[PDB]
Design a protein around this ligand. Sequence first.
Ligand SMILES: [Zn+2]
Ligand SMILES: [Zn+2]
Ligand SMILES: [Zn+2]
Length: 109
Amino acid sequence: GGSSRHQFDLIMCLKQPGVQTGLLCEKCDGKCPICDSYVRPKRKVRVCENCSFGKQAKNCIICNLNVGVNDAFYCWECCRLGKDKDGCPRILNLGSNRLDRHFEKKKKV
Ligand SMILES: [Zn+2]
Ligand SMILES: [Zn+2]
Ligand SMILES: [Zn+2]
């Protein structure tokens, strides 16, 4: 099941997490970086030092643009599966289309 056109394309940084916690902008607030399903959290996401000392530290990890306000938490489901154990949860895949394929009269995000 899966391993095809159900990837989600969660291309994330996945390096070695540092001390700096991954911040979410209110627009991605509540979203689990690994899956995005507004489900029970568990542990604050740690961004890799490469990102911490790489300018992209305070800015939201999910939409890597707007500054983050709340630390992201890995959802229990991702923790159970063991996706969080990979590393830095910075979403890289997101160049545009914050979610799905709709801006719907909201600039783009
Ligand atoms: Zn998750
Ligand atoms: Zn990183
Ligand atoms: Zn965001």
